């Protein structure tokens, strides 16, 4: 676990570097964003499971339920963007300059 | 005043609308005997017939309703428009910009009556049709190119928010016959107007206004003969089917917001005062301060409606 | 908006900060932050103009990644202490994450790029909520954890914000963005004293709220997003010219007005704690903020800019009034200074 | 010494120093990628600020 | 700071302990200020809404001068308590931990010899 | 084996590295669906049958599938050859090995020993996840209510955005 | 916390489950339930500033009931030793390693 | 980090080599960071162009670092007075001048000299008077 807990944490940082280094399509980002929620969900579930802390298992799921809607909002913004530009490239989102 | 409270508790425009309830504008050249048709159609369906927008239409709209002094009403003369075209001071553009603001107020007042009372609206020429005068003015030397851009910018900023005319009527009489119509009506300023300028006005309608609106609304073209026969024209309006157009999507919860806009005149023309400094439009601080510091001192205008004692308002100490 | 939806959203935008503040289980603090993120995005795109979709898509990505980083801090703590909440023992890196993350949601310092841009594409109204009822939530989380955060980082984010906010503001001419920039700056002072005296953060916030809320309802009374637009205030509504003048100078720290107290007591508390290096530099560039505030003063009040002829038309029509809140929040803000001792 | 040298040094210079500093800090593409990276840099430096002062 | 104190009332405005303190005199300059602060709010409102400044809303003027003042007595009543707690807390500590706050003897100037810098 | 988890952990990082090189929107979805499979497996390793399967049931086919779905609808313009990315990805595949290697020589270590299932009752029942997740209805009924509002106001948030 | 609407209202929607020693379902105590107790009944009435120096024995222990790392170092060291000796045959897989030795109920 | 600190440990004016090396590094480090922000935002046109800018900023910063270190150390050596804000000011004075040159502007050298030197001098005073920066809360 201590060893593994590292891999998951770096997974979250590799997913962190991903969402903080965009490239073209946004759907990639949102997708990456989700990679973190999976890593957080896995780590929360793992420690809760090896701490036998059953009172906390509610959280691993609350994390997913909130993350799913969060993503729902994210995709509706994405659909809104490729309806106004139709290409979903982080590239054209610069009117606000 | 109308608010979401009122909307939540009844007061929905949808239940106040009926077949005769539409925004109908009749547009023509400088002289199409348009006035009669409108009042006639108005008389037919009880439609509130709004008069053609005027320099002091806003003053008649606000407070006492007595006509304001010219400088208080923006110093615009249609009279000077004609006798001095391409004037150094640009009274013609200032006249046009005030006219657009006046119809913006008239159209908004019309929409407020339509959504509240539910009585349909006849307003003669509309904001949508106003452009023909400017197109003709730029076609000749009356207005310069930027002047045109400034009007277009105001039009693009304010006109889209308001819903389109349900149907538009076109009382057309040829370039020559309107000038003879002009010749016998008495004012001399209307007389001696350029035949080519009148040519450009009706041409601008035929080239741009009728086709454009031909999808946004039910355009009903009528020749002079069909005109002067309000009965027949009225009949045809009652005949057209109000289907094609953006009005179809106006659900009650959508109308509410539009109502609250027209309900606020200060917003209707918010973009009419945009700080674009073209020289004709600019008040100028010293002249503008004097004109404001003078318009604001007129009786009943110093304070808000209901609070100025000069005109006989009372109960101010508890309002 | 179907009034029902308006209620659900507004309730969430309001249940969002309130859950954060009330709960102690950090998790419940995170979802309070999550709701706020979900509730604000619908309102941001109400006009649905092309600028708006850009605004929300930025606000959302910036907010979302920060939310995920805050959750990671809670997840890590859970393994360094079984507790679901930061404690004396917490690994320092665990807390620093929370500072960076929360400083992104609040938009302080080197993460100050999203706010000016989202403040530019949202309406004036939703601008206020995005600036002041969305700062309460994250700040609550920080104020709760103050005993444990780092004095060094906060100070750096504090000073940076002050500078970025000031410098950014000098060039801007769009009002929405001038305010966005001011908020970055004031937010900076607030986070400077958090490690030392949290109670003053809550003063430097309220005063900012009692100053900004009147200032924005002023900008929208005439819905002017341009200084040129606010400059013709003298014709559209002359009375607000007097208080707009004092509130903006109050937003900057000039001494007779209420705005001095937050800066004065923050400086007094920092000198009490010996940061006479940091406090001095902050106060100095704080003076840069007043320069752009007074430049606006010049255009709107001290000098009368020329107006268009159609302005006479808008005068004629009765001006829809400014809510009462403007007054009560303009006076309590422009002049309460004589009552400072009880405020602190 | 009055006018130019005592106005270019104290009053005007401070005018310029800032003016130029705002020009560089506020000339931003507006693109999200650029801005975000800067968030990356920040995380890196703060990670270090903690690391070296461990 | 003062939170976390023993007995802290978790959400109360002014704990009854504040009864022991004297009540704020209604004419306390501060409450009177709040009054004027209020009257001005009222007058300002009238102005922004374009009404006769002083002769209008004479009912509102009262609501204002009387809302602000009402607020004051009950706020000052508290802020007064908070400050009073601060002493209870401060003075107590000075004693409970006496050695740290020791009484000092100040030598009469006769004894002390501050150096004299001459102006000349 | 004993390195039952490590290996998997390593695969999870590989999938995250794939999502991080931001491959084509749907080619990487697969990537998530892969590491989600992987994370599903690890949790099962520790006895979280329910919590585990849950992920395989909701994030895997519910969230992710909907994700690509939308990719197809938009942002699957499918206009850098992912093969270039695979090339880099391969680099990381072993580049991570480098990161681990330093600590590998430094060495816990030697695969994975008893660094899982620390303590389990050698007798007894009711010890099983899903008993904990079902505290949403006894002694943890506030997480349940707030999740409700998320999804509930989610409906209203989405439509409002869509409209 | 920032606004204690919970203590005031007396409700406890967020406090019952913040630590590993809180009520676990079906009274299945978690690992360390012993320590955390000993480390929070200690730091009760003593503020943090003084829950961080004198109540350090109970956290240093609870930091090793849950991380359980000092153990690793012990065991890992033991492991290596065996390895070296065994390679030179200095040490032989114990009877335990040989299995049998009477595995009993 | 034990490194940078060394700069302070040995009395000023002594062991200039170490001083200059340390000062040069700090400037260079700042150069990298500064270039990074300068490249992340306001990006370049080609990778090479940006690599150049990193170099330009790094060297310029490294230079200001060196001359500051060298001038201050030597000024102290030649002047024989180790503790004096003036040493540093001369150093900061020089540092600014290097910046001015790299930017090819006499004017910048002006502001650079005054502003930069003053700052460095204050650092000396700060160390001499034991001023505390980013202090822990001790209320
Ligand atoms: C005018 C209307 C007057 C109505 C009078 C109604 C009847 C009445 O109140 O008389 C009895 C009543 C009896 O008073 P008292 O308690 O017997 O007086 C003895 C006190 O010891 C004497 O009072 P005190 O000195 O003990 O009061 C304590 C405290 C009381 O504190 C205050 O009340 C401050 C009031 C400031 C005004 O003292 C201070 O004032 C400290 C603050 C000094 C100013 C600090 C700020 C300076 C910079 C900012 C200046 C203001 C800028 C405003 C913003 C910009 C505006 C454009 O008189 C009053 O309380 C009112 C006195 C005047 C108040 C201010 C009026 C203005
Ligand atoms: C501590 C002292 C702080 C400084 C105090 C003195 C400065 C007060 C702040 C002034 C800031 C604005 C300066 C420029 C104002 C321009 C006003 C103007 O252009 O005139 C129009 C304006 C509104 O007009 P309206 O009232 O509708 O009717 C006239 C229509 N032309 O006409 C008006 O606005 C009329 C009302 C103006 C406000 C009156 C304020 C009077 C002065 C207040 C002094 C307070 C002194 C306190 C001393 C405390 C000592 C402890
Ligand atoms: C020892 C004596 C020190 C005296 C210091 C005097 C400071 C003020 C002098 C005049 C500054 C000034 O006029 O600012 C103008 C500058 C540019 O703005 P603008 O006014 O539009 O352009 C005019 C350029 N002369 O506006 C600016 O860019 C900001 C000007 C400085 C504002 C105060 C900055 C303080 C910084 C402390 C660090
Ligand atoms: C408080 C009062 C302080 C009074 C200081 C008076 C110093 C007067 C020095 C003589 C005047 C020099 C001057 O005003 O030049 C302004 C300068 C003109 O531009 P130029 O030098 O050609 O370079 C443009 C770079 N964008 O504009 C610039 O060059 C601005 C960019 C260079 C800034 C140089 C100063 C940097 C200081 C760094 C300090 C780090 C600690
Ligand atoms: C802090 C107070 C000083 C702020 C300015 C520091 C220097 C910033 C910088 O140099 O960025 C330059 C960049 C524009 O670059 P460019 O137009 O090429 O300018 C060169 C002109 N010859 O301008 C920009 O890209 C925007 C500003 C970049 C700096 C943003 C904030 C940097 C903060 C540095 C410390 C961060 C600490 C974080 C701790 C966690
Ligand atoms: C001091 C602190 C320094 C912190 C780092 C600063 C780095 C420099 C920042 C400015 C760099 C110059 C600006 C341009 C950078 C750039 O263009 O790369 C973006 C990168 C590539 O994708 P794209 O956006 O398509 O760019 C193609 C350009 N022709 O887009 C991406 O890379 C997306 C993410 C995929 C790659 C990372 C995936 C995670 C695994 C990383 C393993 C190690 C990679 C090392 C490189
Ligand atoms: C014995 C006398 C020793 C005097 C030492 C100080 C002055 C030394 C001057 C050397 C020459 C500097 C010079 O010529 O450059 C002026 C500088 C840049 O000017 P620029 O517009 O770039 O054109 C220069 C073209 N060769 O423009 C500047 O920025 C000049 C900045 C330094 C000004 C020094 C004099 C200031 C006097 C202030 C008096 C206040 C009372
Ligand atoms: N935008 C405009 N610019 C200039 N003149 C305008 C404009 N709009 C209306 N007019 C004036 O309105 C007049 C036509 O109105 P008229 O037909 O006489 O009213 P009625 O409908 O009562 O007969 C024209 O002479 C024309 O000058």
UniProtKB/Swiss-Prot annotation, chain A:
The chain crosses the membrane at residues 2-22, 26-46, 58-79. It catalyses: a ubiquinone + NADH + 5 H(+)(in) = a ubiquinol + NAD(+) + 4 H(+)(out). Its EC number is 7.1.1.2. Its main location: mitochondrion. Keywords: Electron transport, Membrane, Mitochondrion, Mitochondrion inner membrane, NAD, Respiratory chain, Translocase, Transmembrane, Transmembrane helix, Transport, Ubiquinone. Gene3D superfamilies: 1.10.287.3510. One of its GO terms (cellular component) is mitochondrion. It is a multi-pass membrane protein. The keyword Transport applies. It is found in: Mitochondrion inner membrane. It holds the Pfam family Oxidored_q2. InterPro entries: NADH_UbQ_OxRdtase_chain4L/K, NUOK/Mnh_C1-like. One of its GO terms (molecular function) is NADH dehydrogenase (ubiquinone) activity. GO terms for biological process: aerobic respiration; ATP synthesis coupled electron transport; proton motive force-driven mitochondrial ATP synthesis. The keyword Lyase does not apply. Core subunit of the mitochondrial membrane respiratory chain NADH dehydrogenase (Complex I) which catalyzes electron transfer from NADH through the respiratory chain, using ubiquinone as an electron acceptor. Part of the enzyme membrane arm which is embedded in the lipid bilayer and involved in proton translocation. Belongs to the complex I subunit 4L family. Core subunit of respiratory chain NADH dehydrogenase (Complex I) which is composed of 45 different subunits. This is NADH-ubiquinone oxidoreductase chain 4L.
Curated annotation (Swiss-Prot), chain B:
Complex I is composed of 45 different subunits. This a component of the hydrophobic protein fraction. CDD domains: NDUO42 (cd02030). It comes from Mus musculus (Mouse). This is NADH dehydrogenase [ubiquinone] 1 alpha subcomplex subunit 10, mitochondrial. GO terms for cellular component: mitochondrial inner membrane; mitochondrial matrix; mitochondrion; myelin sheath; respiratory chain complex I. Keywords: Acetylation, Electron transport, FAD, Flavoprotein, Mitochondrion, Phosphoprotein, Respiratory chain, Transit peptide, Transport. Changing residue 214 to D: Phosphomimetic mutant; able to rescue mitochondrial depolarization in a Pink1 mutant background. Transmembrane segments: none annotated. Its main location: mitochondrion. Its cofactor is FAD. One of its GO terms (biological process) is proton motive force-driven mitochondrial ATP synthesis. The modification Phosphoserine is found at residue 214. InterPro entries: Deoxyribonucleoside_kinase, DNK_dom, NDUFA10, P-loop_NTPase. GO terms for molecular function: NADH dehydrogenase (ubiquinone) activity. Binds 1 FAD per subunit. Phosphorylation at Ser-214 by PINK1 is required for the binding and/or reduction of the complex I substrate ubiquinone. Acetylation of Lys-206 is observed in liver mitochondria from fasted mice but not from fed mice. The modification N6-succinyllysine is found at residues 86, 249. The keyword Electron transport applies.
From Swiss-Prot, chain C:
One of its GO terms (biological process) is proton motive force-driven mitochondrial ATP synthesis. It is an enzyme of class 7 (translocase). The chain crosses the membrane at residues 1-21, 25-45, 56-76, 92-114, 149-171, 178-198, 200-220, 241-261, 274-294, 324-344. It is found in: Mitochondrion inner membrane. GO terms for molecular function: NADH dehydrogenase (ubiquinone) activity. It catalyses: a ubiquinone + NADH + 5 H(+)(in) = a ubiquinol + NAD(+) + 4 H(+)(out). Its EC number is 7.1.1.2. InterPro entries: Complex_I_Subunit_2 (IPR050175), NADH_DH_su2_C (IPR010933), NADH_UbQ_OxRdtase_chain2 (IPR003917), ND/Mrp_TM (IPR001750). It is a multi-pass membrane protein. GO terms for cellular component: mitochondrial inner membrane; mitochondrion; respiratory chain complex I. It comes from the Eukaryota. Keywords: Electron transport, Membrane, Mitochondrion, Mitochondrion inner membrane, NAD, Respiratory chain, Translocase, Transmembrane, Transmembrane helix, Transport, Ubiquinone. Core subunit of the mitochondrial membrane respiratory chain NADH dehydrogenase (Complex I) which catalyzes electron transfer from NADH through the respiratory chain, using ubiquinone as an electron acceptor. Essential for the catalytic activity and assembly of complex I. Core subunit of respiratory chain NADH dehydrogenase (Complex I) which is composed of 45 different subunits. Interacts with TMEM242. Belongs to the complex I subunit 2 family. This is NADH-ubiquinone oxidoreductase chain 2. It comes from Mus musculus. The lineage of its organism: Eukaryota, Metazoa, Chordata, Craniata, Vertebrata.
Swiss-Prot record, chain E:
Keywords: Electron transport, Membrane, Mitochondrion, Mitochondrion inner membrane, Respiratory chain, Transmembrane, Transmembrane helix, Transport. Complex I is composed of 45 different subunits. Interacts with TMEM242. It is a single-pass membrane protein. The lineage of its organism: Eukaryota, Metazoa, Chordata, Craniata, Vertebrata. Belongs to the complex I NDUFC2 subunit family. This is NADH dehydrogenase [ubiquinone] 1 subunit C2. The gene is Ndufc2. GO terms for biological process: aerobic respiration; mitochondrial electron transport, NADH to ubiquinone; mitochondrial respiratory chain complex I assembly; negative regulation of non-canonical NF-kappaB signal transduction; negative regulation of reactive oxygen species biosynthetic process; positive regulation of ATP biosynthetic process; positive regulation of mitochondrial membrane potential; proton motive force-driven mitochondrial ATP synthesis. Accessory subunit of the mitochondrial membrane respiratory chain NADH dehydrogenase (Complex I), that is believed not to be involved in catalysis but required for the complex assembly. Complex I functions in the transfer of electrons from NADH to the respiratory chain. The immediate electron acceptor for the enzyme is believed to be ubiquinone.
């Amino acid at each position: 676990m201590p060893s593994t807990f590292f891999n998951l944490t770096m997974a979250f940082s590799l997913s962190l570097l991903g969402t903080l280094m965009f490239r073209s399509h946004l759907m990639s980002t949102l997708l990456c964003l989700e990679g973190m929620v999976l890593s957080l969900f896995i780590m929360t579930s793992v420690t809760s499971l090896n701490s036998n802390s059953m009172s906390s298992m509610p959280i691993p799921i609350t994390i997913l339920v909130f993350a799913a809607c969060e993503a729902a909002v994210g995709l509706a913004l994405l659909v809104k963007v490729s309806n106004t530009y139709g290409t979903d490239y982080v590239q054209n989102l610069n009117l606000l300059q | 005043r109308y608010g979401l409270l009122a909307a939540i508790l009844g007061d929905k425009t949808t239940k106040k609308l009926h077949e005769y309830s539409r925004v109908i504008t009749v547009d023509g050249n400088i002289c199409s005997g348009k006035n009669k048709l409108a009042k006639e159609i108005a008389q037919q369906l009880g439609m509130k017939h709004y008069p053609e927008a005027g320099i002091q239409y806003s003053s008649t709209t606000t407070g006492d309703g007595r006509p304001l002094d010219i400088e208080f009403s923006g110093s615009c003369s249609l009279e000077k428009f004609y006798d001095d075209p391409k004037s150094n001071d640009g009274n013609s553009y200032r006249l046009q910009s005030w006219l657009y603001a006046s119809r913006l107020l008239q159209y908004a007042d019309a929409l407020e009556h339509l959504l509240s009372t539910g009585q349909g609206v006849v307003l003669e020429r509309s904001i949508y049709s106003d452009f023909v005068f400017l197109e003709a003015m730029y076609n000749q030397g009356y207005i310069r190119k930027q002047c045109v851009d400034h009007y277009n910018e105001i039009k693009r900023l304010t006109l889209p928010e308001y819903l389109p005319p349900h149907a538009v009527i076109y009382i057309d009489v040829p370039v020559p016959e309107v000038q003879s119509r002009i010749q016998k009506k008495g004012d001399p300023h209307e007389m001696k107007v350029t035949s080519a300028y009148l040519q450009d006005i009706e041409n601008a309608y035929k080239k741009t206004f009728l086709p454009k609106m031909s999808e946004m609304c039910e355009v009903l073209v009528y020749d002079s003969w069909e005109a002067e026969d309000p009965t027949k024209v009225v009949e045809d309006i009652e005949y057209l089917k109000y289907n094609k157009g953006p009005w179809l999507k106006q659900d009650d919860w959508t109308f509410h917001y539009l109502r609250m806009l027209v309900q606020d005149k200060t917003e209707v023309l918010n973009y009419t005062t945009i700080p674009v400094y073209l020289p004709e439009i600019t008040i100028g601080a010293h002249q503008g301060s004097r004109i404001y510091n003078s318009f604001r001192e007129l009786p009943g205008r110093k304070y808000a409606p209901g609070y100025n004692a000069e005109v006989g308002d009372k109960w101010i100490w508890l309002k | 908006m179907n009034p029902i939806t308006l209620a659900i959203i507004y309730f969430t935008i309001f249940l969002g900060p309130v859950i954060t503040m009330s709960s102690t289980n950090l998790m419940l603090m995170w979802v309070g932050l999550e709701f706020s993120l979900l509730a604000i995005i619908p309102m941001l795109i109400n006009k649905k103009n092309p600028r708006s979709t850009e605004a929300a898509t930025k606000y959302f990505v910036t907010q979302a990644t920060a939310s995920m980083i805050i959750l990671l801090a809670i997840v890590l703590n859970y393994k360094q202490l079984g507790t679901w909440m930061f404690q004396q023992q917490t690994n320092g890196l665990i807390l620093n994450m929370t500072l960076m993350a929360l400083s992104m949601k609040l938009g302080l310092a080197p993460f100050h790029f999203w706010l000016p841009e989202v403040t530019q594409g949202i309406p004036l109204h939703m601008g206020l909520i995005l600036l002041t009822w969305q700062k309460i939530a994250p700040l609550s989380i920080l104020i709760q954890i103050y005993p444990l955060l780092n004095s060094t980082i906060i100070l750096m984010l504090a000073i940076t914000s002050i500078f970025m906010g000031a410098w950014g503001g000098l060039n801007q001419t769009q009002m929405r963005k001038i305010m966005a920039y001011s908020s970055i700056a004031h937010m900076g002072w607030m986070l400077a004293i958090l490690p030392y005296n949290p109670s003053l953060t809550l003063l430097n916030l309220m005063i900012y709220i009692i100053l900004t809320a009147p200032m924005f309802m002023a900008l929208m009374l005439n819905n002017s997003m341009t200084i040129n637009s606010i400059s013709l205030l003298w014709n559209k509504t002359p009375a607000m010219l007097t208080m707009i003048s004092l509130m903006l100078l109050s937003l900057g720290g000039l001494p007779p007005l209420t705005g001095f107290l937050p800066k004065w007591i923050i400086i007094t508390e920092l000198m009490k704690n010996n940061c006479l290096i940091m406090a001095t530099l902050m106060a100095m560039m704080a003076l840069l903020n007043l320069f752009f505030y007074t430049r606006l003063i010049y255009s709107t009040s001290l000098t009368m800019f020329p107006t268009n002829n159609n302005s006479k038309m808008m005068t004629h029509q009765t001006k829809t009034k400014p809510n009462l809140m403007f007054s009560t929040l303009a006076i309590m803000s422009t002049m309460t200074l004589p009552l400072a001792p009880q405020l602190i | 010494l009055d006018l130019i040298w005592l106005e270019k040094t104290i009053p005007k210079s401070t005018s310029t120093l800032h003016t130029n500093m705002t020009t560089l800090t506020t000339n931003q593409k507006g693109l999200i990628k650029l801005y975000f990276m800067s968030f990356l840099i920040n995380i890196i430096l703060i990670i270090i600020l903690y690391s070296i002062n461990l | 700071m003062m939170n976390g104190r023993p007995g802290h009332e978790p959400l109360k405005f002014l704990p009854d302990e504040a009864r022991s303190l004297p009540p704020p005199k209604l004419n306390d300059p501060r409450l009177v200020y709040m009054g004027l602060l209020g009257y001005c709010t009222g007058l300002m409102d009238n102005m922004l809404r374009m009404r006769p400044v002083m002769r209008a809303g004479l009912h509102r003027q009262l609501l204002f001068v009387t809302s602000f003042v009402f607020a004051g007595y009950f706020y000052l009543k508290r802020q007064n308590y908070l400050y009073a707690v601060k002493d209870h807390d401060m003075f107590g500590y000075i004693k409970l931990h006496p050695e740290d706050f020791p009484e000092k003897e100040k030598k009469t100037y006769a004894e002390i010899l501050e150096p004299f810098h001459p102006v000349r | 084996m004993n390195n039952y988890i490590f290996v998997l952990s390593s695969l999870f990082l590989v999938g995250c590295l794939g999502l991080a090189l931001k491959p084509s929107p749907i080619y990487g979805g697969l990537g998530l669906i892969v590491s989600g499979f992987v994370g599903c497996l690890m949790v099962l390793g520790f006895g979280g049958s329910f919590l585990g399967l849950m992920v395989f049931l909701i994030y895997l086919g519910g969230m992710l599938v909907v994700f690509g779905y939308t990719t197809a609808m938009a942002t699957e313009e499918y206009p850098g050859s992912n093969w270039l990315i695979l090339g880099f990805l391969v680099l990381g595949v072993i580049m991570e090995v480098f990161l681990i290697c330093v600590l590998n020589y430094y060495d816990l270590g030697d695969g994975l020993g008893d660094w899982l299932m620390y303590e389990v009752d050698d007798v007894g029942v009711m010890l099983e996840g899903g008993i904990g997740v079902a505290a949403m209805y006894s002694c943890a009924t506030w997480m349940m209510v707030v999740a409700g509002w998320s999804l509930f106001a989610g409906i209203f948030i989405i439509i409002e955005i869509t409209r | 916390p920032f606004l204690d609407i919970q203590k005031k209202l007396g409700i406890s929607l967020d406090r019952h489950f913040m630590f590993l020693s809180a009520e676990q379902p079906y009274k299945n105590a978690a690992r360390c339930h012993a320590f955390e107790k000993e480390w929070i009944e200690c730091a009760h009435g003593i503020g943090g500033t003084r829950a961080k120096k004198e109540c350090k024995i109970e956290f240093d222990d609870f930091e090793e009931c849950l991380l359980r790392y000092k153990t690793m170092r012990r065991m890992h060291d033991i492991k290596k030793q065996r390895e070296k000796l065994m390679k030179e045959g200095k040490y032989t897989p114990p009877p335990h390693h040989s299995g049998r030795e009477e595995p009993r109920p | 980090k034990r490194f940078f600190e060394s700069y302070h440990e040995v009395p000023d004016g002594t062991q200039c080599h170490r001083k200059t090396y340390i000062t040069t590094a700090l400037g260079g480090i700042c150069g990298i960071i500064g270039s990074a922000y300068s490249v992340s935002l306001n990006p370049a046109d080609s990778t090479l162009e940006a690599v150049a800018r990193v170099g330009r900023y790094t060297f310029t910063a490294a230079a200001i670092g060196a001359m500051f270190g060298l001038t201050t150390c030597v000024s102290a050596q030649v002047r024989e007075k180790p503790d004096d804000p003036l040493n540093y000011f001369i150093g900061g004075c020089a540092g600014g001048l290097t910046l001015g040159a790299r930017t090819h502007s006499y004017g910048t050298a002006a502001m650079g000299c005054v502003y930069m030197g003053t700052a460095a001098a204050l650092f000396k005073i700060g160390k001499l008077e034991g001023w505390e920066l980013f202090p822990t809360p001790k209320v």
